[PDB]
Design an enzyme around this catalytic site. Sequence first.
Site, PDB file in Angstrom:
ATOM      1  N   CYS A  73       0.793  -1.216   0.000  1.00 46.02           N
ATOM      2  CA  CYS A  73       0.000   0.000   0.000  1.00 46.02           C
ATOM      3  C   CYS A  73       0.838   1.285   0.000  1.00 46.02           C
ATOM      4  CB  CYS A  73      -1.015  -0.019   1.139  1.00 46.02           C
ATOM      5  SG  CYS A  73      -0.309   0.287   2.775  1.00 46.02           S
ATOM      6  N   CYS A 122     -17.461 -35.547   4.834  1.00 42.49           N
ATOM      7  CA  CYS A 122     -16.514 -36.381   5.557  1.00 42.49           C
ATOM      8  C   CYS A 122     -15.109 -35.762   5.479  1.00 42.49           C
ATOM      9  CB  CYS A 122     -16.548 -37.826   5.082  1.00 42.49           C
ATOM     10  SG  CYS A 122     -15.619 -38.962   6.149  1.00 42.49           S
ATOM     11  N   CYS A 124     -17.226 -42.920   8.410  1.00 41.88           N
ATOM     12  CA  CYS A 124     -17.984 -42.598   7.208  1.00 41.88           C
ATOM     13  C   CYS A 124     -19.093 -43.651   6.883  1.00 41.88           C
ATOM     14  CB  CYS A 124     -17.053 -42.353   6.030  1.00 41.88           C
ATOM     15  SG  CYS A 124     -17.881 -41.815   4.528  1.00 41.88           S
ATOM     16  N   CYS A 131      22.765  -6.341  21.695  1.00 43.84           N
ATOM     17  CA  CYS A 131      22.402  -6.209  23.127  1.00 43.84           C
ATOM     18  C   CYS A 131      22.475  -4.753  23.616  1.00 43.84           C
ATOM     19  CB  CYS A 131      23.192  -7.158  24.025  1.00 43.84           C
ATOM     20  SG  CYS A 131      22.630  -7.187  25.755  1.00 43.84           S
ATOM     21  N   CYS A 168      34.119   5.408  36.120  1.00 47.42           N
ATOM     22  CA  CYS A 168      32.680   5.280  35.920  1.00 47.42           C
ATOM     23  C   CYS A 168      32.169   3.825  36.024  1.00 47.42           C
ATOM     24  CB  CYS A 168      32.281   5.943  34.607  1.00 47.42           C
ATOM     25  SG  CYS A 168      30.500   6.168  34.386  1.00 47.42           S
ATOM     26  N   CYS A 196      14.025  -2.178  31.028  1.00 47.81           N
ATOM     27  CA  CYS A 196      14.784  -2.202  29.768  1.00 47.81           C
ATOM     28  C   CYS A 196      15.100  -3.610  29.290  1.00 47.81           C
ATOM     29  CB  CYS A 196      16.041  -1.355  29.873  1.00 47.81           C
ATOM     30  SG  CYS A 196      15.726   0.421  29.836  1.00 47.81           S
ATOM     31  N   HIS A 225      13.135  -4.442  25.983  1.00 50.97           N
ATOM     32  CA  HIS A 225      14.042  -4.424  24.847  1.00 50.97           C
ATOM     33  C   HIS A 225      15.509  -4.799  25.175  1.00 50.97           C
ATOM     34  CE1 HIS A 225      13.555  -0.106  26.197  1.00 50.97           C
ATOM     35  NE2 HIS A 225      14.850  -0.297  26.438  1.00 50.97           N
TER      36      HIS A 225
HETATM   37 ZN   LIG Z   1     -15.409 -40.943   5.037  1.00 54.57          ZN
HETATM   38 ZN   LIG Z   2      30.771   6.368  31.952  1.00 54.35          ZN
HETATM   39 ZN   LIG Z   3       0.129  -1.868   3.673  1.00 54.52          ZN
HETATM   40 ZN   LIG Z   4      16.092   1.122  27.748  1.00 51.10          ZN
END
Ligand SMILES: [Zn+2]
Ligand SMILES: [Zn+2]
Ligand SMILES: [Zn+2]
Ligand SMILES: [Zn+2]
Lengths: 76, 379
Positions: free
Chosen positions: B177, B273, B296, B345, B355, B371, B375
């Site tokens: 479409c 049948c 049958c 990942c 950190c 999270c 996802h």
């Molecule tokens: Zn049959």
């Molecule tokens: Zn950092």
């Molecule tokens: Zn479509």
């Molecule tokens: Zn996230």
Amino acid sequence: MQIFVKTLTGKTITLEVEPSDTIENVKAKIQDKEGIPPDQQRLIFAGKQLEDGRTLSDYNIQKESTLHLVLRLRGX
Amino acid sequence: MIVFVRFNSSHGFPVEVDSDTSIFQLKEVVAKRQGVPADQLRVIFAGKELRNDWTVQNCDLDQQDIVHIVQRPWEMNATNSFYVYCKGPCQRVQPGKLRVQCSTCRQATLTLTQGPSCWDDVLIPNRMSGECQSPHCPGTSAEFFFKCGAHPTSDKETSVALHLIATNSRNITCITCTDVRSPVLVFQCNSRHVICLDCFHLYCVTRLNDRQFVHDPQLGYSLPCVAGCPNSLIKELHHFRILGEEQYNRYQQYGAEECVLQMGGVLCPRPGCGAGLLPEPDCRKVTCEGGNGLGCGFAFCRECKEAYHEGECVDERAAEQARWEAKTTKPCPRCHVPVEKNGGCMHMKCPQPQCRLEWCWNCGCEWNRVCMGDHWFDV
Ligand SMILES: [Zn+2]
Ligand SMILES: [Zn+2]
Ligand SMILES: [Zn+2]
Ligand SMILES: [Zn+2]
Ligand SMILES: [Cl-]
Ligand SMILES: [Zn+2]
Ligand SMILES: [Zn+2]
Ligand SMILES: [Zn+2]
Ligand SMILES: [Zn+2]
């Protein structure tokens, strides 16, 4: 969990099952309800033939999903 | 003039129209025949949707041609990598939550060695390693499951991940479409072609009526990319739950019917049948024996299917635009030192010794359970 087993005939079988239950256990649960030997039974889910050693999780069959029952007939 | 209509069946029925009959009027004919409202009908002829102002003649609709009718009614916010099929209360495709538990004890004690970077990591079982924080448990691998995030969920209340559906963030036009809708289904064809969920319904329903779904014994019954790209069949077949319960059950029924045939059996020919029968390799006599079901109980010839006898019987341009892939750094939210992202990942670890902030590449906040859940990895 509950699952269904439908023939192409329109017959619906209600089964109590676990996602860890093999196709062999499912085939046994069908024989306990309908008396069909598991060697006659052939199960299909979403057009794929289900193999004996695999589980319900492996095909992602969910709670209240339907499998198709088809039969190997001899003497066929 | 007779045109054949398929409306949720592969059994086409005849309809009387003229060359100058408009598609608005064709819809009115079909509406009256099925006891359905005309505004809810879509006319699909040889892939293209026919619009209301065109006449039968304009659409090159000759005597005894097949048209389809498909009934269709007309940091701050969350980012969702995962979509699931909620079977209830939603009964639709909803954004979901990724969750982990131990393969062994099946508890949320498994702390991963490293996080998922793609769908293979969370879809293939026992692909990820970790350590179960419970004392007496030798749990080495993780087990990922999904849940609908639209409502409050129970432990065992899981849902299938529909790994194809992605939220259309880059505003990619749909292959069919050419509009911008979200979410979209992304095909696994080399071009990674994108289709909106409305066009996808139209593609599956018409293909189902045509019996043009593909059977692969190692997969089942599916469809490739709309564009027809090789190696692009939908692998997770619950994607068809998008079509709604009625269409899904029909798809499952046609699929089982194709499965039986692919295995060399037969379907009982008697009216109402259609039993899936698997006669032995060298058989001409087949007996529909049920007593319950598949009762049958007809005996027929595997060839003529009569009672058993003894003797003999897309737009190139639109496709180019509809591709998933057709700037490298982000600063750490604390020290402002830019970090290059390696892989999918979202869990970043600042390498700055002063950190070492663990943060979400997507949100730019410190790493948390929301999270991870919404996802863990990008798409
Ligand atoms: Zn049959
Ligand atoms: Zn950092
Ligand atoms: Zn479509
Ligand atoms: Zn996230
Ligand atoms: Cl497009
Ligand atoms: Zn839900
Ligand atoms: Zn454990
Ligand atoms: Zn494609
Ligand atoms: Zn014959």
